[PDB]
Amino acid sequence: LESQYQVGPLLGSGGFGSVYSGIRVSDNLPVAIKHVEKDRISDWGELPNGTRVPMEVVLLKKVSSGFSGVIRLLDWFERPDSFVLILERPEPVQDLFDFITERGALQEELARSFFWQVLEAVRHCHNCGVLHRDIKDENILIDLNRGELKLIDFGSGALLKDTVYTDFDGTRVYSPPEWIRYHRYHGRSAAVWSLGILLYDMVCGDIPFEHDEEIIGGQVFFRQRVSSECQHLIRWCLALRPSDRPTFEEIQNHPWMQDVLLPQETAEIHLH
């Protein structure tokens, strides 16, 4: 209903998709109003009501408990040719891709805080039965006042399963070598690979690989001064064989990850 929301202009000139600024009339809460065409939907799911919805709606609902680290779906609507998703809109924000573009390689203290929060957000997803499958800096929002990161865009995600995945519609330069070579992957170890790409991206200022040959080659060159502890974590996440990669527990127990800043400290030291 355009009676329940005041709809404003397109956000980000379409870079997030068909997302418009909005305000919930009930209480002036800022929202992001995201439109998805039925004709362009890959995977469908069934709601507990038996209603057929896009998988993105199913995954968003499963993670929407109010944990700060993922975008919260507040409501959704079906239209003849589309679904409309009402998402919370934190302000002020910048996405982590733009943030790294203009700040350059991040100090390890800041990368540690950001990476730690991404890890907690992905753990939350997996605990809710959700595999995001498109972790990358473009899909992470920074709340610049609170110092809190938010994972966004579940449009490539899937229900978390323990069996093999044979489909993938995330970002190729973040996808693991077992996907490039065999078009097969398991969810957790593929997520860990994309987190290694993300961590390299943060401390070096851009992702390490652009070509399939680099992804499968097993060589990580560091173009920026990076501590030995951080290099070790990155190389571990980017092990060619999935079983050689760390678990989320091993990542968060790694020496490089200790003594993380709180979100508010992060904002005060690095963002304000």
């Binding site: 891709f97 573009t101 498109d134 990358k136 473009e138 865009d153 449009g155 490539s156 519609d169 995330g170 970002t171 190729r172 330069v173 973040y174 200022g205 851009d206």
Partner: peptide, 8 residues
């Protein structure tokens, strides 16, 4: 060096 976004 050119840093770019990558569509899903």
């Amino acid at each position: 060096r050119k840093r770019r976004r990558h569509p899903s």
